[PDB]
Each structure stands twice: as C-alpha cells, then as structure tokens.
Structure 1
Amino acid sequence: SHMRISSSFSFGGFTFKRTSGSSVKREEEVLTGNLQTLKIRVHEGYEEFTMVGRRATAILRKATRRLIQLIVSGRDEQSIAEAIIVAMVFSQEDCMIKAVRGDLNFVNRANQRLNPMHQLLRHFQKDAKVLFQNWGVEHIDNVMGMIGILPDMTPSTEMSMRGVRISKM
C-alpha cells in the first residue's frame, strides 16, 4: 500500500507522480539545529518523480534521504525557486533538516498541527536562504539547453547547486 499511496500525490503546490523505481516507508526521528525532534516518514530506496505546478515543472531522481538529480523549468525566478524548495524538502536530505532555524509549530487552516514534512515545507516556503546556502554547489558540464543556478538564484554556465539544473526549454 505504501507504493500505491506514494505513486501519485500533491505536495507544496506540486502534483507528484512516480515514474521509476520503488521505496519502502519508515518512521525516522531527526533533530533540527534548534534541537527539535521531528518524526518524518522516510522513503527508503531509489525513485524518480515528475513534479507539475502552476508556474513550474520538474523532474526529480532521488534515493533514500538523498537528491540525485533535479531539472526544473519555470516562468520566472520566483516560480523556479519555489519548485527547487519543494524538491529539496521532499528529498528529506540531512542538510535540509540542518538548515532549519528556530522551532516549527505550523498549523493548517483548521488550526491543527501539520505533519513533520509540512513543518519543514512551511518553514522553507517563508525563506530558503539558509537552505540554498547550505545545500552545496558543484562544477557542471556545458550541456545545450541546460544552465546552472547558484544559491543567490543567479544563473551560471560553470556551476550550480548540487544536483540542480535549470532547463532553458
């Protein structure tokens, strides 16, 4: 049932669909720098998702708590950043957890406490500076139709945030 439920869903304003590979679920306690414990539902294994939003789309390959490749197209800098934020949170990477600042106590529109993955999502939806700063950058190859993006959102032909590429298409 875990495979079935995680095959198609909405997260962070994006429709996710699994296109390849599998995972198993498990509950994993993590600790933010503010020493807050979050019990997250972790996907264990290699999978590939497509993400479709209002103003951006992405393709994501990930493994257990590790983003492998992310390609995003968007209408503008804002919508592209938004897609990158959701992918980074969804990746469940340690460096994303470690980018949290302060305590998370987000509530939905009925004033009920949001689940841990949504605590993370809400947090970084407000400001992704620490997230992008701590994610990491790498050298990239020059591939036609693709360009890198730095943590300050400036495009670069030489470097990019780790695993992240922006499609000109």
Structure 2
Amino acid sequence: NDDVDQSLIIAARNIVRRATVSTDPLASLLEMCHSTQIGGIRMVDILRQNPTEEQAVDICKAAMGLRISSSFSFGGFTFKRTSGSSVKKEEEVLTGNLQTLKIRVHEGYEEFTMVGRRATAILRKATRRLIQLIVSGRDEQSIAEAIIVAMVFSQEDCMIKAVRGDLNFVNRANQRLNPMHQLLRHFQKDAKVLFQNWGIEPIDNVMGMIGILPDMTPSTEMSLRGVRVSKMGTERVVVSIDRFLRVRDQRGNVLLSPEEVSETQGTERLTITYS
C-alpha cells in the first residue's frame, strides 16, 4: 500500500499543479483524473479505495465527492482542532511596512495539533494571542518551520508588525494570495525579524522540555515566548469544492486549496500514464 500511496500522491500533485493554471481548474482536474492510470488502474478507482489524506489527493477526492479528513492545512502542516472554538471577524491591520490588510481574525480560545513531515506541535491560542506552542522536530530548522507557521497563524500584532516588505504574492495563475498566505510566504522567505521581535522569556526546568532562542539554538534557560521544545510528538466528512479547487467543510471553513499542495517533485514507483 505504501507504494500505491507514493505514486498516487505524485500523480495528484502533478494534476493539481497543472489544473491551477487552467481557466477552470476544477474541470481541468476532473478531466486529468479521468484520463490518468497508475500501475494500469484508473486513478478514480484508486481514489475511491485508498485512505491517503495528503493535500493534493484530498483535493482530487473532494472533486469527485469522496469523504476526506476534516482537518485543514496551513504551511503544509495538518491542523486538527482538539479543543475550543472561534468566530471570524474582519479587521483591518497595518503591517510593519505600512501596508493595510483586511484579515479574518479568529476570536476565541482554541487548541490544535499540527502534524508535518519533519515536526509536530500542540498550539494553544486565544484571540490574536499565542499562549503555548509545544513543538518537536527532527532538527532546529524543522522546528523553526513549525514555529513560523504557528506565529503567523496566531495573528499576533507583533507578527504583523514584523513584516518588512510589501505583500503581493500570487499563485501559479497570477491570483493574489489571501492575507494569511501573504504573511506566511513573507516569513518563510526570512524569519529573522519575526523571531527577534517576538519576545523571549525565562523557562523552568521541566524534564523532557527545553527552550529555543531566536537564533534557533537550544537553551535550558530561556526560550521564545510561549514556545517549548519537546522530544515527544481523524473523522472523514463530506466537503465541497469550487472552480478554483478551494475545498470547504459544511460550515464553510477552507480546509485545502492549491496553495497548500507541496512543491516537492518525485519519481513514481508505479507507472503513471495518460490517455
């Protein structure tokens, strides 16, 4: 099965990337899936009978009415809300480069798990407030990637004020990214100002936990505010899909879009063919 999964992910990612530049991505994706075989089996037959939950695969599943994980993706991390709730309120904010953004601010206490390939975390937040991030990962760089995502997701003003360029990122089709993705793409390029402005704090000696400093080095004495490093680290639902491959749950939350599909290329172990 792991080898079916590997080839299915490659096929689905290639299809989503190609579809995104078409005038009608949903129609393009459906035609490509209909015409693709993996190991000589119709891709649609694999999608119906394969439990993989990767972002591109789940976009393809949604397009043909299959149930998918209720979790969402941000920065490539799968987020599962484990406690709490939030309501959205539009607010206008001013970045550190004097650009205004209209952001859907989430109001309420929430806890999430974040699962990525190289790091995992527990994130506890309230309105525009990161409370705790307990993160585990393969190295300090992988941990830093999760921290950046969590700091942007928190919607904190100090993150908004750490922006140092204009935000005009677009997708493959030259469509402007939404504000949360604008902020994320900015800080993925360079997080030094974000990390230097976030704040540090002293930590207590807790077995299995350590701090991480703005320079991404470990410390037993201090850490980025709210952040601790640990050595320790889903229901399927009906979703909707639209022309531009935005996948929403029944309550309208945007679980997936092409912006959350990895750019990683790979070489399939089962032949992918196209008729």
Q: TM-score range by the shorter chain?
A: over 0.9
Q: CA deviation at 1:147?
A: 0.3
Cα gap change, 1:5 to 1:163, in 2 (>3 Å): farther
Q: CA deviation at 1:5?
A: 13
Equivalenced residue count is 167
Residue 120 (structure 1) aligned with residue 174 (structure 2): no
After superposition, the C-alpha distances for 1:94-136 in whole angstroms (9 at most, x for unaligned) are 0000000010100112221000000000000001000000000
**Greater Rg, structure 1 or structure 2?**
2
| Paired position in structure 2 for 1:28 | 91
Task: Give 5+ residue unaligned stretches, structure 2.
Answer: 1-65, 233-275
Cα gap change, 1:13 to 1:51, in 2 (>3 Å): same
Any idea what SS the aligned residue of 1:28 has?
strand
Name which of structure 1's ranges 142-151 and 33-42 shifts more when overlaid on structure 2. 33-42
Whole-angstrom CA distance in 2 between matches of 1:127 and 1:33 = 14
| RMSD between aligned residues | 2.5
Q: CA deviation at 1:34?
A: 1.4
Cα gap change, 1:34 to 1:158, in 2 (>3 Å): same
After superposition, the C-alpha distances for 1:55-74 in whole angstroms (9 at most, x for unaligned) are 11010000000000001111
Cα gap change, 1:81 to 1:4, in 2 (>3 Å): farther
Whole-angstrom CA distance in 2 between matches of 1:144 and 1:4 = 41
Cα gap change, 1:165 to 1:6, in 2 (>3 Å): farther
Return the structure number with greater helix share: 2
Q: Bigger relative contact order, structure 1 or 2, given CA contacts below 8 A and separation 6+?
A: 2
Cα gap change, 1:5 to 1:113, in 2 (>3 Å): farther
After superposition, the C-alpha distances for 1:26-49 in whole angstroms (9 at most, x for unaligned) are 111100121101111110010000
Whole-angstrom CA distance in 2 between matches of 1:124 and 1:94 = 14
Q: CA deviation at 1:24?
A: 0.8
Q: CA deviation at 1:168?
A: 2.1
Given that residues 12 and 121 in structure 1 are in contact (C-alpha distance below 8 angstroms), is that contact kept between their aligned partners in structure 2? yes
After superposition, the C-alpha distances for 1:60-95 in whole angstroms (9 at most, x for unaligned) are 000000000001111112111100000000000000
Given that residues 141 and 158 in structure 1 are in contact (C-alpha distance below 8 angstroms), is that contact kept between their aligned partners in structure 2? yes
Whole-angstrom CA distance in 2 between matches of 1:46 and 1:128 = 26
Whole-angstrom CA distance in 1 between matches of 2:69 and 2:99 = 26
Cα gap change, 1:62 to 1:28, in 2 (>3 Å): same
Cα gap change, 1:94 to 1:7, in 2 (>3 Å): farther
Task: Give 5+ residue unaligned stretches, structure 1.
Answer: none
Name which of structure 1's ranges 5-14 and 106-115 shifts more when overlaid on structure 2. 5-14
Any idea what SS the aligned residue of 2:180 has?
helix
Q: CA deviation at 1:6?
A: 12
Cα gap change, 1:146 to 1:97, in 2 (>3 Å): same
Return the structure number with greater strand share: 1
| Paired position in structure 1 for 2:167 | 104
Cα gap change, 1:87 to 1:5, in 2 (>3 Å): farther
Residue 67 (structure 1) aligned with residue 141 (structure 2): no
Any idea what SS the aligned residue of 1:41 has?
strand
Any idea what SS the aligned residue of 1:58 has?
strand
Residue 52 (structure 1) aligned with residue 115 (structure 2): yes
The runs of at least 4 aligned residues of structure 1 exceeding 4 Å deviation read: 3-7
- In the superposition, the TM-score normalised over structure 2's length comes to 0.59
